């Protein structure tokens, strides 16, 4: 099953990411079930907005919020929702929900992927316009949900982002 | 997997129908597995029809022919086959193939994934052009299926689409 | 799970082949993890070239490489990653790559999902520019791969592609 | 413009046909318009159905029911609206609508575009079932038109499809 | 050529609107210029957005900012780009950019395209959820666009609409 | 029509690009016929390779080869064929066919239609992975094209790229 995926082959730099929503997709929003492992109907967003990158999670990793942590990973082609993805985590771009903190990582896809994501090591080398996209999207993507609210606190480095991977894997082996 | 999903949150209003085909996808005729829950295909349809409804099933469920309720799902955009997606029943369309009695049931988004499908509480709310479509695919899209044949006898309402989801749901938990 | 499926209903003539890359699609190779069952990426292919029929294995066979046997399928429509469909095996394509000896069957489509591939029996009636399109496709698809090599020795014919799978069921069934 | 296109380089079997519906689009019924030259909507056909092969006209040619010799043209892949392709036709289905006479031709790909439709050089040599597909398309496509209604007489062979060329071309040069 | 598209047969009730941008398409915004009649980029946009319906102009028309009178068209299938369909204007969305005023019209396909817009006469019986979602596309896709800026005054009803293709088609005929 | 689209607004440096093939389409090479401005269908491409760019040529521009300067045109999203894109050329890479010298310029998106190649200002700065990928294309698409044959001799700078432009334009103002 998708549940009995690990968390990553070397935590924190060497990790799989579990796709839900490929980029560009019409804009449903899918969720693995932690039940049955099925991909669920979340809901039909009502903005004409896409995903700008392919959006899932990591296994066996529990965030602050209650879930995993969810994750960003640009690719040259969008991904099937819940194929897994070997990647490295390169950034994080925190938010405030009406559940409180909850970052979202990015993570290029590994080196034995691709060649095509190894010049990027670290926030600041990611597309400006990529990054301007993806706050934008998370900024805006919600605006016409009744009970749904977020605010874009902004954008952190790499080893920001491991140091998120193990806290939240920690806490999904005690909690 | 997909064989443990539940029928419904609450049978008969609030139920789960697993997608199998989608909207308007190309002539293939998949089936979930009821051994080992992957999708198989089960033909190349030979008509140049297209389903005009996502096509799954509800889990746990035994209809009169020996399978499970199959449902018909409008959305605004086509889900992927293996998703669930939270429905509310809302009207049945008779008919009768070489296997007898075969309904199928539709039935729209529940108003968690959306608003969009709110003001369709029964049969006679459905867009007539969508009915007069799903009943024009269902009388034609075997005709060139030597062995197969299929007779529309016509619609019902929202409480004869419950009594079949009920009556399949407890056959299931004896036979 | 994928994991549980049959190698066929009555092999080696009646097979069923696990679908990884469907025909046409963007040029990501995906993989069934045989741990999880998941679907994971394998790799961005660096080459624009596109996979000429779906792609995939039949479960429980092991070939000389040390995994399982991979089947081309042609069909009228791409098929959904992780889909299984019922094959007849009509030829085989014998290569070299770095791992020695790694045939690559053509199966179509059984004729209980369809007619239309009933007059191939045999590696002469498959259309002769898709057999020419194929072997192009794997003496290409890698030549940006650094460490990777693929030479195409050439077709053989339906009784050369059964006893590879009996040889691969067998040796499924012993290591 | 799309109006100054030749009948053919060599009519009756050498020919250019004017692309409007390629083959397996969303079911939208376009024309290209002689006054301006532009593509236009027609309608919006209401069966799930799509056109089996792309769909279009022969320019500077008058049928019998006052408008251009129309063409179905199978290709390995869909064409763009207002392309023109070479071909060569190899058949007609004779029908009648509420305008009388209204025959569809068959034309392949000219071996210059392509040598895989070679092969055919008559009505006999075209896959049963593209024609069965084709013939039911026809049939039904209309069902739900009410002031619109379809008999099929059948299928001739490329000498009566290249007389209705000849005799069309010659109408259009007086009428 | 499309620059001798009629504006409509009976203006302003039954006009033309001339296709640029597909509903549901890539963020690309290409523009009819009005020197070749050809299909230019204008821009690749920022935003993580896309239309919400196809979007056009009328052709022979002069709105007060100094170019045709654009139109939203919703259909059940996106559209060509170069296309044109016979529609009904039903409403009109007002708003200021950096040029002032700029009006867009909502119109549906005409009855005889279809007769699946045939209930809706004017703004109010447009879908809710379609007039918040057209809204908020225009006031978020410029967001990221440094010299452009977008305010949204409001929904005014079908007779606004036609007034103003009334006054822009006069305009055109003088200025 | 577009035999009536300029070069470019200021040439070398500022020019138009007539789409005929957009990235990652279908194998049908299409080509603008000068005579009457359509779309023709060229061939149907043999080999199951896409075009890794967007492909047209510069209008009033003639090449060694007897016909207008091709181009390759990187866009974040494919384009439509028969659109034109404002580029900056950027490089060129040099072939032999069976015909001579043919050239393919690669000229990026101009500034005002997005900012994201604006760091590309000569061959060196394009992604080596993409350079190597065009290569690869244009030196395998007609491997299974009896008469044609092609030899790819290698990179040249911007300067290389607008003198082409320059010459193949002054040739067109007087053959």
Not at 40 to 69: E, K, Q
Not at 79 to 102: F, H, W, Y
Not at 113 to 123: A, G, M, P, Q, T
């Amino acid at each position: 099953s998708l549940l009995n995926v690990p968390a990553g082959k070397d935590l924190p730099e060497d990790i799989y990411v579990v796709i839900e929503i490929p980029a560009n997709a019409d804009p449903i929003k899918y969720e693995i079930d932690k039940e049955s492992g099925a991909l669920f109907v979340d809901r039909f967003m009502s903005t004409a907005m896409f995903y700008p990158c392919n959006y899932g999670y990591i296994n066996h990793t529990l965030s602050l919020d209650g879930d995993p942590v969810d994750v960003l990973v640009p690719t040259p082609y969008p991904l099937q929702p819940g194929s897994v993805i070997r990647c490295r985590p390169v950034g994080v771009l925190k938010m405030t929900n009406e559940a409180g903190e909850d970052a979202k990582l990015v993570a290029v896809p590994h080196s034995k992927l691709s060649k095509e994501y190894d010049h990027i090591k670290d926030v600041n080398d990611l597309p400006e316009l990529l990054k301007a996209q993806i706050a934008h999207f998370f900024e805006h993507y919600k605006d016409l949900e009744k009970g749904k609210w977020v605010k874009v606190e902004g954008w952190e480095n790499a080893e920001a982002a491991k140091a998120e991977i193990v806290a939240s894997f920690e806490r999904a082996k005690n909690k």
